Amino acid sequence: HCRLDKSNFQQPYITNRTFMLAKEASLADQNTDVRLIGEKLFHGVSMSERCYLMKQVLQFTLEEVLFPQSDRFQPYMQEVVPFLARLSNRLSTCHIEGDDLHIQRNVQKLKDTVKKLGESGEIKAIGELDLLFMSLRNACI
Protein backbone atom coordinates (compact mmCIF):
# COMPACT_ATOMS: atom_id res chain seq x y z
CA HIS A 1 0.00 0.00 0.00
CA CYS A 2 1.03 3.64 -0.32
CA ARG A 3 1.55 4.85 3.23
CA LEU A 4 4.35 5.24 5.79
CA ASP A 5 4.08 5.29 9.59
CA LYS A 6 4.40 8.71 11.19
CA SER A 7 7.22 7.25 13.31
CA ASN A 8 9.46 7.26 10.23
CA PHE A 9 9.60 11.05 10.46
CA GLN A 10 9.40 11.69 14.24
CA GLN A 11 13.06 10.75 14.77
CA PRO A 12 15.08 13.95 15.55
CA TYR A 13 18.57 12.66 14.84
CA ILE A 14 18.06 11.12 11.38
CA THR A 15 15.73 13.98 10.43
CA ASN A 16 18.14 16.75 11.44
CA ARG A 17 20.75 14.74 9.60
CA THR A 18 18.66 14.81 6.44
CA PHE A 19 17.97 18.53 6.80
CA MET A 20 21.64 19.25 7.46
CA LEU A 21 22.57 17.24 4.37
CA ALA A 22 20.00 19.25 2.46
CA LYS A 23 21.38 22.52 3.83
CA GLU A 24 24.99 21.70 3.02
CA ALA A 25 24.07 20.95 -0.60
CA SER A 26 21.87 24.02 -0.96
CA LEU A 27 24.76 26.26 0.10
CA ALA A 28 26.59 24.66 -2.84
CA ASP A 29 23.64 25.08 -5.19
CA GLN A 30 24.07 28.47 -6.86
CA ASN A 31 21.11 28.17 -9.25
CA THR A 32 18.23 29.97 -7.53
CA ASP A 33 16.12 30.03 -10.70
CA VAL A 34 15.26 26.34 -10.66
CA ARG A 35 13.32 24.38 -8.05
CA LEU A 36 12.92 20.63 -8.58
CA ILE A 37 10.41 19.55 -5.92
CA GLY A 38 7.25 21.63 -5.48
CA GLU A 39 3.45 21.77 -5.85
CA LYS A 40 3.76 21.73 -9.67
CA LEU A 41 5.21 18.22 -9.36
CA PHE A 42 1.68 17.21 -8.33
CA HIS A 43 0.25 19.05 -11.36
CA GLY A 44 -2.91 17.01 -12.01
CA VAL A 45 -2.18 14.21 -9.55
CA SER A 46 -5.08 13.12 -7.35
CA MET A 47 -4.50 13.50 -3.62
CA SER A 48 -4.79 9.73 -3.31
CA GLU A 49 -1.90 9.25 -5.75
CA ARG A 50 0.64 11.69 -4.35
CA CYS A 51 2.39 9.04 -2.24
CA TYR A 52 2.78 6.85 -5.30
CA LEU A 53 4.32 9.76 -7.18
CA MET A 54 6.72 10.51 -4.34
CA LYS A 55 7.73 6.85 -4.40
CA GLN A 56 8.93 7.43 -7.97
CA VAL A 57 10.76 10.63 -7.11
CA LEU A 58 12.40 8.96 -4.12
CA GLN A 59 13.49 5.96 -6.21
CA PHE A 60 14.92 8.17 -8.93
CA THR A 61 16.67 10.33 -6.36
CA LEU A 62 18.22 7.25 -4.80
CA GLU A 63 19.42 5.81 -8.10
CA GLU A 64 20.38 8.85 -10.15
CA VAL A 65 21.28 11.35 -7.44
CA LEU A 66 22.42 9.96 -4.11
CA PHE A 67 24.34 6.89 -5.31
CA PRO A 68 26.28 8.87 -7.95
CA GLN A 69 27.08 11.44 -5.24
CA SER A 70 27.66 9.02 -2.34
CA ASP A 71 31.23 10.38 -2.15
CA ARG A 72 30.37 14.03 -1.50
CA PHE A 73 28.74 15.80 1.47
CA GLN A 74 30.10 13.69 4.31
CA PRO A 75 29.42 12.61 6.96
CA TYR A 76 25.69 13.17 6.37
CA MET A 77 25.44 11.28 3.07
CA GLN A 78 26.68 8.13 4.79
CA GLU A 79 23.75 8.06 7.28
CA VAL A 80 20.90 9.56 5.27
CA VAL A 81 21.00 7.41 2.13
CA PRO A 82 20.45 4.18 4.10
CA PHE A 83 17.52 5.93 5.79
CA LEU A 84 15.89 7.07 2.56
CA ALA A 85 16.66 3.61 1.17
CA ARG A 86 14.58 1.88 3.84
CA LEU A 87 11.64 4.21 3.15
CA SER A 88 11.98 3.43 -0.54
CA ASN A 89 11.98 -0.30 0.23
CA ARG A 90 8.88 0.13 2.42
CA LEU A 91 7.08 1.68 -0.55
CA SER A 92 8.36 -0.96 -2.98
CA THR A 93 4.91 -2.59 -2.66
CA CYS A 94 2.92 0.58 -3.32
CA HIS A 95 0.84 0.69 -6.51
CA ILE A 96 -1.97 2.79 -7.96
CA GLU A 97 -5.34 1.48 -9.14
CA GLY A 98 -5.32 3.36 -12.43
CA ASP A 99 -3.22 4.43 -15.41
CA ASP A 100 0.37 5.66 -15.01
CA LEU A 101 0.39 8.63 -17.42
CA HIS A 102 -0.33 11.98 -15.82
CA ILE A 103 2.07 10.81 -13.10
CA GLN A 104 4.84 9.34 -15.24
CA ARG A 105 4.88 12.56 -17.30
CA ASN A 106 5.24 14.60 -14.11
CA VAL A 107 8.16 12.58 -12.79
CA GLN A 108 9.83 12.63 -16.19
CA LYS A 109 9.89 16.41 -16.26
CA LEU A 110 11.86 16.25 -13.02
CA LYS A 111 14.30 13.63 -14.30
CA ASP A 112 14.72 15.79 -17.42
CA THR A 113 15.44 18.96 -15.48
CA VAL A 114 18.00 17.14 -13.35
CA LYS A 115 19.77 15.68 -16.38
CA LYS A 116 19.81 19.00 -18.24
CA LEU A 117 21.41 20.66 -15.22
CA GLY A 118 23.97 17.85 -15.15
CA GLU A 119 26.09 17.37 -12.03
CA SER A 120 24.80 20.61 -10.54
CA GLY A 121 21.33 19.15 -10.97
CA GLU A 122 22.28 16.24 -8.75
CA ILE A 123 23.61 18.74 -6.24
CA LYS A 124 20.33 20.65 -6.44
CA ALA A 125 18.37 17.45 -5.76
CA ILE A 126 20.42 16.75 -2.64
CA GLY A 127 19.86 20.35 -1.52
CA GLU A 128 16.15 19.66 -1.76
CA LEU A 129 16.11 16.45 0.28
CA ASP A 130 14.27 18.49 2.91
CA LEU A 131 11.48 19.23 0.44
CA LEU A 132 11.48 15.62 -0.69
CA PHE A 133 11.36 14.43 2.95
CA MET A 134 8.29 16.58 3.68
CA SER A 135 6.43 15.99 0.40
CA LEU A 136 7.10 12.34 1.10
CA ARG A 137 5.75 12.74 4.63
CA ASN A 138 2.55 14.64 3.77
CA ALA A 139 1.68 12.41 0.79
CA CYS A 140 2.08 9.07 2.57
CA ILE A 141 0.53 10.19 5.90
Binding site: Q10, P12, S26, D33, G38, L131
Partner: protein, 202 residues
Protein backbone atom coordinates in the same frame (compact mmCIF):
# COMPACT_ATOMS: atom_id res chain seq x y z
CA UNK B 1 34.17 42.65 5.07
CA UNK B 2 31.28 45.08 4.62
CA UNK B 3 28.29 42.78 4.94
CA UNK B 4 28.00 39.80 7.29
CA UNK B 5 25.43 37.44 8.79
CA UNK B 6 22.64 38.10 6.31
CA UNK B 7 19.76 36.02 7.62
CA UNK B 8 16.05 35.74 8.37
CA UNK B 9 14.76 36.11 11.91
CA UNK B 10 11.40 34.32 12.03
CA UNK B 11 8.87 34.27 14.86
CA UNK B 12 5.23 33.20 14.45
CA UNK B 13 5.82 33.78 10.73
CA UNK B 14 6.89 37.37 11.15
CA UNK B 15 9.97 37.26 8.93
CA UNK B 16 12.58 39.94 9.55
CA UNK B 17 15.79 40.14 7.53
CA UNK B 18 18.87 41.15 9.53
CA UNK B 19 22.59 41.55 8.93
CA UNK B 20 25.77 43.01 10.46
CA UNK B 21 28.60 45.14 9.11
CA UNK B 22 31.90 43.32 8.66
CA UNK B 23 35.50 44.47 9.43
CA UNK B 24 35.82 47.26 6.84
CA UNK B 25 32.38 48.52 7.83
CA UNK B 26 31.34 52.09 8.68
CA UNK B 27 28.34 53.95 10.20
CA UNK B 28 27.34 55.94 7.07
CA UNK B 29 26.80 52.74 5.08
CA UNK B 30 23.46 52.40 3.29
CA UNK B 31 21.66 49.12 2.48
CA UNK B 32 19.27 48.04 -0.27
CA UNK B 33 17.21 44.85 -0.09
CA UNK B 34 15.82 42.53 -2.78
CA UNK B 35 14.02 39.20 -2.47
CA UNK B 36 12.96 36.37 -4.78
CA UNK B 37 11.13 33.06 -4.83
CA UNK B 38 13.26 29.94 -5.20
CA UNK B 39 12.40 28.44 -8.57
CA UNK B 40 11.80 31.85 -10.14
CA UNK B 41 14.21 34.04 -12.07
CA UNK B 42 13.70 37.65 -11.06
CA UNK B 43 14.68 39.60 -7.98
CA UNK B 44 12.21 42.15 -6.66
CA UNK B 45 13.23 45.33 -4.89
CA UNK B 46 11.72 45.83 -1.45
CA UNK B 47 10.02 49.21 -1.75
CA UNK B 48 10.60 50.30 1.83
CA UNK B 49 14.14 48.99 2.28
CA UNK B 50 16.25 50.91 -0.25
CA UNK B 51 19.24 53.01 0.83
CA UNK B 52 18.30 52.60 4.50
CA UNK B 53 20.74 52.97 7.36
CA UNK B 54 19.13 50.48 9.75
CA UNK B 55 20.23 46.84 9.80
CA UNK B 56 16.92 44.98 9.49
CA UNK B 57 14.00 44.86 7.05
CA UNK B 58 10.52 43.38 7.49
CA UNK B 59 9.87 40.88 4.67
CA UNK B 60 6.85 39.22 6.30
CA UNK B 61 4.37 40.06 3.55
CA UNK B 62 6.80 39.26 0.73
CA UNK B 63 7.55 35.79 2.14
CA UNK B 64 4.02 34.84 3.20
CA UNK B 65 3.25 32.09 0.68
CA UNK B 66 3.54 28.88 2.69
CA UNK B 67 4.16 26.88 -0.47
CA UNK B 68 7.21 28.85 -1.53
CA UNK B 69 10.85 29.10 -0.39
CA UNK B 70 12.76 32.37 -0.75
CA UNK B 71 16.05 34.20 -0.86
CA UNK B 72 16.92 37.73 0.20
CA UNK B 73 20.03 39.78 -0.48
CA UNK B 74 21.44 42.97 0.94
CA UNK B 75 23.64 45.31 -1.04
CA UNK B 76 25.78 47.59 1.09
CA UNK B 77 27.19 50.83 -0.29
CA UNK B 78 29.96 52.30 1.88
CA UNK B 79 31.03 55.92 2.31
CA UNK B 80 33.43 55.58 -0.61
CA UNK B 81 30.97 54.31 -3.22
CA UNK B 82 32.29 50.84 -2.37
CA UNK B 83 29.63 48.14 -2.47
CA UNK B 84 29.06 44.52 -1.49
CA UNK B 85 26.25 42.01 -1.90
CA UNK B 86 25.34 39.01 0.24
CA UNK B 87 22.29 36.79 0.31
CA UNK B 88 20.65 34.53 2.86
CA UNK B 89 20.48 30.75 2.59
CA UNK B 90 17.32 29.21 1.12
CA UNK B 91 14.50 30.30 3.45
CA UNK B 92 11.62 28.15 4.62
CA UNK B 93 9.36 29.88 7.12
CA UNK B 94 7.65 26.59 8.02
CA UNK B 95 11.07 25.28 9.11
CA UNK B 96 12.84 28.27 10.62
CA UNK B 97 10.09 30.08 12.49
CA UNK B 98 10.07 30.13 16.29
CA UNK B 99 6.77 29.84 18.16
CA UNK B 100 5.74 32.34 20.82
CA UNK B 101 4.08 31.13 24.04
CA UNK B 102 0.49 29.80 23.68
CA UNK B 103 -2.40 32.20 24.24
CA UNK B 104 -3.64 30.65 27.49
CA UNK B 105 -6.04 31.78 30.24
CA UNK B 106 -5.85 30.04 33.64
CA UNK B 107 -9.05 29.95 35.64
CA UNK B 108 -8.81 28.64 39.18
CA UNK B 109 -11.56 26.82 41.04
CA UNK B 110 -12.02 25.25 44.47
CA UNK B 111 -10.41 21.88 43.72
CA UNK B 112 -9.28 22.18 40.12
CA UNK B 113 -7.38 24.52 37.80
CA UNK B 114 -8.75 25.30 34.36
CA UNK B 115 -6.62 26.33 31.37
CA UNK B 116 -8.05 27.73 28.15
CA UNK B 117 -5.83 27.94 25.06
CA UNK B 118 -6.93 30.41 22.41
CA UNK B 119 -6.19 30.25 18.70
CA UNK B 120 -3.04 32.15 17.87
CA UNK B 121 -3.46 34.24 14.69
CA UNK B 122 -0.61 34.59 12.21
CA UNK B 123 -0.01 36.92 9.25
CA UNK B 124 -0.57 34.03 6.85
CA UNK B 125 -3.69 34.75 4.80
CA UNK B 126 -6.02 32.19 3.30
CA UNK B 127 -7.61 32.55 -0.11
CA UNK B 128 -10.52 34.54 1.32
CA UNK B 129 -7.85 36.74 2.91
CA UNK B 130 -8.47 35.96 6.59
CA UNK B 131 -5.79 34.99 9.09
CA UNK B 132 -4.69 31.39 9.60
CA UNK B 133 -3.81 30.18 13.06
CA UNK B 134 -0.91 27.97 14.04
CA UNK B 135 -3.42 25.14 14.33
CA UNK B 136 -4.57 25.79 10.75
CA UNK B 137 -0.97 25.56 9.52
CA UNK B 138 0.40 22.73 11.64
CA UNK B 139 -2.15 19.91 11.59
CA UNK B 140 -0.27 17.74 14.08
CA UNK B 141 0.17 20.59 16.56
CA UNK B 142 -0.64 19.64 20.16
CA UNK B 143 -0.28 21.15 23.60
CA UNK B 144 1.70 19.89 26.57
CA UNK B 145 0.40 21.16 29.92
CA UNK B 146 1.80 20.77 33.42
CA UNK B 147 0.61 21.73 36.87
CA UNK B 148 3.37 21.86 39.48
CA UNK B 149 2.48 21.47 43.14
CA UNK B 150 6.02 21.13 44.50
CA UNK B 151 9.57 20.11 43.49
CA UNK B 152 8.47 16.47 43.74
CA UNK B 153 5.07 15.96 42.10
CA UNK B 154 3.79 17.36 38.82
CA UNK B 155 0.57 16.74 36.90
CA UNK B 156 0.44 16.69 33.11
CA UNK B 157 -2.14 16.79 30.32
CA UNK B 158 -1.84 16.93 26.54
CA UNK B 159 -3.89 17.10 23.37
CA UNK B 160 -5.23 19.13 20.49
CA UNK B 161 -8.27 20.63 22.18
CA UNK B 162 -8.25 24.07 23.80
CA UNK B 163 -9.71 23.49 27.25
CA UNK B 164 -8.02 21.50 30.02
CA UNK B 165 -8.86 21.03 33.69
CA UNK B 166 -6.64 19.46 36.33
CA UNK B 167 -8.74 17.72 39.00
CA UNK B 168 -8.00 16.46 42.50
CA UNK B 169 -6.65 19.72 43.92
CA UNK B 170 -6.72 21.01 47.52
CA UNK B 171 -8.56 24.36 47.97
CA UNK B 172 -6.87 27.69 48.73
CA UNK B 173 -3.54 26.27 47.48
CA UNK B 174 -0.92 27.55 45.06
CA UNK B 175 0.11 25.82 41.84
CA UNK B 176 2.39 26.63 38.91
CA UNK B 177 0.84 26.08 35.50
CA UNK B 178 2.94 25.59 32.35
CA UNK B 179 1.75 25.17 28.75
CA UNK B 180 3.83 24.79 25.59
CA UNK B 181 3.07 24.29 21.89
CA UNK B 182 4.41 21.18 20.21
CA UNK B 183 4.55 20.39 16.50
CA UNK B 184 6.38 17.03 15.98
CA UNK B 185 6.44 17.19 12.18
CA UNK B 186 8.85 20.11 12.31
CA UNK B 187 10.23 19.27 15.74
CA UNK B 188 9.16 22.74 16.91
CA UNK B 189 8.43 23.65 20.51
CA UNK B 190 7.07 27.00 21.64
CA UNK B 191 8.40 29.11 24.46
CA UNK B 192 6.53 27.97 27.55
CA UNK B 193 3.63 29.94 28.97
CA UNK B 194 3.48 30.02 32.75
CA UNK B 195 0.59 31.00 34.97
CA UNK B 196 0.98 30.81 38.75
CA UNK B 197 -2.46 30.24 40.25
CA UNK B 198 -4.16 29.44 43.54
CA UNK B 199 -7.33 27.40 44.05
CA UNK B 200 -10.30 29.14 45.66
CA UNK B 201 -10.92 28.92 49.48
CA UNK B 202 -13.90 26.57 50.11
Amino acid sequence: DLLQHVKFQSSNFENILTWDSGPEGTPDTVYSIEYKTYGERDWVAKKGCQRITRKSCDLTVETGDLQELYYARVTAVSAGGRSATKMTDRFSSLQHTTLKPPDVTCISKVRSIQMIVHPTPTPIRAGDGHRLTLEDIFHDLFYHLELQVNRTYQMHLGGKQREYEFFGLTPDTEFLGTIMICVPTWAKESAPYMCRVKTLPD
